[PDB]
Amino acid sequence: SMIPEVQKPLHEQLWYHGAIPRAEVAELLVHSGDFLVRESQQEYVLSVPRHFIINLYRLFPSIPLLIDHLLSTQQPLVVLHRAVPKDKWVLNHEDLVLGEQIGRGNFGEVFSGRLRADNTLVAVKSCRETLPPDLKAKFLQEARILKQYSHPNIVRLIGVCTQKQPIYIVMELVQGGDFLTFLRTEGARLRVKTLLQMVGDAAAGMEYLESKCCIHRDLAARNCLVTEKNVLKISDFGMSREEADGVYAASGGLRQVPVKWTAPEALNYGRYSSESDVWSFGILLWETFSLGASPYPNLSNQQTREFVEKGGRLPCPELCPDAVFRLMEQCWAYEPGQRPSFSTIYQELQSIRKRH
Amino acid sequence: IYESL
Structure with missing residues (x-):
């Protein structure tokens, strides 16, 4: 036989969302009489986007029995209609x-x-x-x-x-x-073919993100991760944004800006795009082929901003393949529209690797 | 690396 759903502990109910934040609640509650139960940050809350605060329970010896009683009887708490499940x-x-x-x-x-x-x-x-x-x-x-x-x-x-x-x-x-630590600890033994594969991996990920209208905004060696087989993966999407029409405009207040990885139009006007991620990609290429050197080491962040505005760019690392440096240079075109796409970048890197 | 701006 089967245990009735209503006889199950709250913790087990599909419509108990626990510590779900407010923003998320409003998103999930769509139609009239949609509802869920959650916990206040020992008060439980019946959210229907009205918030009704809940040894018995009321607004029964358990909260599932209360919800069932409400739902089954259509008694006013607002009338409940549809319980909203956890995704x-x-x-x-x-x-x-x-x-x-x-x-x-x-x-x-x-x-x-x-x-x-x-x-x-x-x-x-x-x-x-x-x-x-x-x-x-x-x-x-x-x-x-x-x-x-x-x-x-x-x-x-x-x-x-x-x-x-x-x-x-x-x-x-x-x-x-992280890839920065990897380059600094393992770099002396890394072959150029391997470095090319690893930035190829990064370009593949970024091409994917562009296809999804995702703008990363903090692309850097420190935010990429390496598997035990040396496959690179892009991480830390904390700053990322999705924009159907390709541009994220910075909203409002203070921002954390990784200045030396950030494009001029992003750094000064808050215009972020796959094009600004391409700039960051160029910095990632420089990190990689310098085996984890810090960019613009003798400049503060303000100084780098001025240096770049005057046309200054990072130097070619020793023994960096010339085709790779040329690609870097293209990534750092001042005008975002003059930068290559991630599709172009990935193709070029695959071409350079196959010739190695 | 990061500056609040």
């Missing part, structure tokens, strides 16, 4: 075994972990609760973006733990760590 990416906290810290970003710590069910190693991005509300409201962007994608050179989303605090975004673990 397929939601993962319970108990499905994840958290491990040690592996990095930090502007939202807080990143940890390794394992899925309890099959031991899959994962990366777990966390959000510090003490951050400003406008920032915390952006935390789930990386999940919203990555839910849509599947590519060998893009970090895979595994799940989202929004049933309780602290909220996590769970992704594949790319076990060789």
